[PDB]
Structure formats: structure tokens, C-alpha cells
Design a protein around this ligand. Structure first.
Ligand SMILES: CC(=O)N[C@H]1[C@H]([C@H](O)[C@H](O)CO)O[C@@](O)(C(=O)O)C[C@@H]1O
Ligand SMILES: CC(=O)N[C@H]1[C@H]([C@H](O)[C@H](O)CO)O[C@@](O)(C(=O)O)C[C@@H]1O
Ligand SMILES: CC(=O)N[C@H]1[C@H]([C@H](O)[C@H](O)CO)O[C@@](O)(C(=O)O)C[C@@H]1O
Ligand SMILES: [Zn+2]
Ligand SMILES: [Zn+2]
Ligand SMILES: [Zn+2]
Lengths: 184, 183, 185
């Protein structure tokens, strides 16, 4: 109702992009009535997307992190984010019990409809720019899409892409804030 | 009572050039002293539906105005229609039109009404939305608080672009901003 | 009395020292929404070095920083650029009668944004944004907000204002920027 659904703010890897637990996705979802206030950042610690080099690897330009939810708002097992520490805040960590329901934290289906025969509108997307290493001249685009995945009831997906040729740049980002209309 | 919105549907509610030619999706959530705001626009017909700058070089901007009285009631003078601007009830509105919404109005000390005194830029918020969800099609959304005359409160959205777009449908991604509330 | 809001008040009375005493008004509003702080910021320089920007006359004037430093209790330290006099909890459009003793719930989270130490420094304690001088679209200036990266304090929120363009006689008064950060409690 007014609680926080988050990933914990530690640096302990909780996310799988290319290989297992290669990244820490810090995501904090806070319910303010009909809108959800969201704060996001990413640290890649290992694998394909850890150290970006577009001189040696020119085709590594984008990747996606998917969060898939069922009818009750529980994170599905096939999401990129691990189910382990995706829960309500208890202090600096989480409560002992994994949550039953989080429908109030899901994106609104009327505002952000699933793919169908009807006309797809752009309002289910939010664009933002974060910066690698905190450097102002190293931007990367974060594209957030609501409810556009199949095999779920609700989805939040993060697409990270860049158009610059980076040479040995560690992929860890500044933080970005956005919001979206809630289901309940 | 914590949310003022246009309804999350796609039923056209806004007049830019011709009558009801657009859908302005605006949600205002009260968070104490600040109002969390989320906004997108879909133009369905008329002058600003399919943008062609190579045919029409002058069509580069337009403004949607919301004008309020002392009680925070929307005026029929505004670009957005009064019919579907109300407090949240599920995925729709309350059956009765609201009487007072001063808590949702932009703070007068922070954003003063037009007057002989100095005008500061802090009553403006700048954002970038994208047409058709395409990253290579940016358009500027300029939000201004309490800068219209003939009303007590106002939130205006100015859409502008500097790129030459050919056959591009004006339907936008969402943008989130906030402002200081009157009470 | 509103304990869910820490602000400078939304007036235009100089409260901040960048180059000379009270040369600016920093309007900052911190609204607590559970474990996230919704923040709203703008800057008006009224006098001194950074008031009227002329980069043709003064090529090197391209940046400045406004620092807010806090102790263990979340009280603003006097060596901060922002004056303590009107940094308080909200009462109407003004502040409460007496200065606050605690505001830990408004401080940046320490696990999320750790104090300078021997550990690996992560970029997530930075929020980048762009505001505009005079409200003109062709006059951008980058606002860089960093959490808990100053030494000599327990908490800190710093605002670095910088620009790349050569501005000639431009009054440094900005549009508003909204962001959020994870709260300590
Ligand atoms: C934080 C920020 O806004 N950075 C922007 C920078 C800076 O204006 C300059 O590098 C001066 O620091 O310019 C860019 O064109 C770039 O480098 O790709 C876009 C980027 O978004
Ligand atoms: C979402 C986003 O930030 N898009 C930006 C794009 C993309 O960086 C590139 O098109 C790579 O896809 O580049 C622009 O110069 C453009 O096309 O006008 C600015 C625009 O704001
Ligand atoms: C509000 C906004 O996005 N302004 C942007 C402007 C405008 O697109 C053009 O001036 C057209 O008015 O273009 C810039 O390249 C510039 O002038 O430095 C970046 C700046 O951020
Ligand atoms: Zn690393
Ligand atoms: Zn259309
Ligand atoms: Zn001045």
C-alpha cells in the first residue's frame, strides 16, 4: 500500500544477463497511490557485458533484462532477476517470508496493454539516459517497457543500449528515476 | 482522493487544433508536499496526427493548456475536456465532478502567477519524449506552472521538435516529473 | 506540522553560498515516500561570480558545486554551502518554529551509497540531469547529484553544476529537476 518492493541495495550479484549471476540490478519500487516510484541502476561484474570493448567487439551494443510476473505479481522463475532477494523491505534487507501478492506494484494493463491485434502505443515505454563509470561523456540508453512480454500477466523490461564506440569501459551505471501507473 | 487523472484509457479528451483530436494521458499523484506526475500524448486526427515537415515546415510546435480556478477546478477554457478529468475510482473516475483539488495545484510561492515582478525559470520542467517509441525521434515536452493569465492555476504542456519528420504519427512515450503542491 | 517534507521553503530569499555570502537561492524539496525520497531542485544565483555568466570574458568559469553535509542525526553541518537558518521541516509554505534534531529518514542510504572508503566506488550514487538557464531550450547546464561522497561528514548531497557551451551574459537561474534516492530508514 505504501511499502517498498526492492532487490536490496547491496553489491551482491542477483541477476543473469549472459551467464549466471553476472550482474547486480538495484531496483527499488515504492508505492505512492496510483503511481509507482522507481529507482534503478546496474552493475555488471562478470561475463560478456562486464568490460565493454567496441574496437574488438563492435556488435556488442545492447542487452535486455526481463522481469516477468504472474496474476498475483510474483516474480516468475524465467526472469533475468533472481527470486532470492526480490521482496518487501524490512530494514536494510527483506522480511523472512516471500510475498504472496504485489498486484498494487504491477503496471496498469489498461494503460499498458499486452501485444494484440489492436494498435500498439508508445506510452508503455519510458526512455532515460544513464552513464557508465559516472562519466558524463559515457552515456547509455535505458529503455523501460511495461507489459510487452508473452508468457506472463505483467512485465517490466530494461533494454540497455549505446551508440558510442567504448574501449575497455566497465559496465556499471548511474541511477535513474521514473514512474508508471499501477494496476490497483 | 490521492490521484487526479484523465483515465488510463485511449478515449480522446483533448483539443489542440480541431475538436477532441488528441488523448492526453495525465496522472497526478499526491505525495505530501510534491505532486508526482506522469504524462503522455496520442494525437489521432487533424493537423498534428501525421507530421510531415518536408510538406509543412512551419508545423514545429503546439501547446496544451490546463487552466484552474481558486478551488482547483478545470476551466472549460482549457485544451483538455472537463468530462473525464476527475479523482481515481478503480480504472475510471468518480461519478461526481470534484469541487476542491487545491492540494493538487502548483504552489503559488514556488510558481507565482504572472505579475509585474521578476519571472524565474523554476516554474518550468524540461523533458524529452519519443514518437512511436523510436529512440531516433525525440520531441521536447516543456511543462510550465502558473504562467497563464485568466486563471488562478495552470499547467501547460508545450510540444516541440527540431528534426525534419516525414510521415510520423504523433504518439509518445511517457514522461515523469514532479512539482511543489499548494497545500 | 509536516514531518514528511524537508525543504528550503519555496521563497526566493538567498540561502546558499557558492562564491560569496548568500549569493544564491537553492530551492530543494525532499518528500519522503516510504524508503524513497522524492527530490525537487532548482537554482537561482542573484549576485557574485556565478550570477551573470560570460565565457568570452571568463573562459575558465564552467562549473561550481553546492554541498550539503550531514552528521549521524541528519543535521546540516555549517560548512555546507546551504545555510542552516531555513533548512527545516515544512509548516505551510514556511518552516516549523524550532530546528530539527533528527532526519535520518531523509538521508541517502549508506548501503546503497557508501561513504568514501577502501572499497570499490560505484557510479550508482550519482544522478545526472539537465536543466536550462533562463528557461531557454538552447541553454543547457548539467546538474550532477552525488550521495555520500564527501569526507568530514556522515551523509552528503552535492550538486555540481557544469556547462560546455560558451555563454555570453547569461543569468544563472535554472529550470527545475526531479529525482529520487534510497532512504537510510
Ligand atoms: C551528463 C551529460 O548530459 N552528458 C552529455 C555530454 C556532455 O554534455 C559533455 O560530454 C560535457 O561533459 O555530451 C554528450 O554529447 C556525450 O558526451 O555523448 C551527451 C551526454 O549526455
Ligand atoms: C533515447 C535517446 O536518448 N535517443 C537519442 C538518440 C539515440 O542515442 C540514437 O538514435 C541511438 O539509438 O540520438 C539522438 O541524437 C537522436 O536520434 O536525435 C538524440 C536522442 O535523444
Ligand atoms: C530542451 C532541450 O532538449 N534542449 C536541447 C536543445 C534543443 O533541442 C534545441 O535548441 C531546439 O530548441 O538542443 C541542444 O542540442 C542544445 O541546444 O544544446 C541540447 C538541449 O538539451
Ligand atoms: Zn568489474
Ligand atoms: Zn493515428
Ligand atoms: Zn539576477
Amino acid at each position: 500500500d505504501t511499502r517498498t518492493l526492492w532487490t536490496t541495495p547491496d553489491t551482491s550479484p542477483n541477476c543473469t544477463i549472459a551467464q549466471d549471476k553476472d550482474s547486480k540490478l538495484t531496483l527499488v519500487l515504492t508505492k505512492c497511490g496510483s503511481q509507482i516510484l522507481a529507482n534503478v541502476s546496474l552493475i555488471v561484474v562478470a561475463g560478456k557485458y562486464h568490460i565493454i570493448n567496441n574496437k574488438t567487439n563492435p556488435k556488442i551494443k545492447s542487452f535486455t533484462i526481463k522481469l516477468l510476473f504472474n496474476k498475483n505479481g510474483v516474480l516468475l522463475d524465467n526472469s533475468n532477476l533472481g527470486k532470492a532477494y526480490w521482496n518487501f523491505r524490512s530494514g536494510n534487507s527483506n522480511v523472512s517470508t516471500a510475498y504472496e501478492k504485489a498486484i498494487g506494484f504491477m503496471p496498469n494493463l489498461v494503460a499498458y496493454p499486452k501485444p494484440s491485434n489492436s494498435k500498439k502505443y508508445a506510452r508503455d515505454i519510458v526512455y532515460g539516459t544513464i552513464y557508465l563509470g559516472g562519466k558524463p561523456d559515457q552515456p547509455a540508453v535505458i529503455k523501460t517497457t511495461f507489459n510487452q512480454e508473452t508468457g506472463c500477466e505483467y512485465s517490466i523490461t530494461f533494454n540497455f543500449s549505446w551508440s558510442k564506440t567504448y574501449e575497455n569501459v566497465e559496465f556499471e551505471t548511474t541511477s535513474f528515476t521514473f514512474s508508471y501507473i499501477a494496476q490497483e
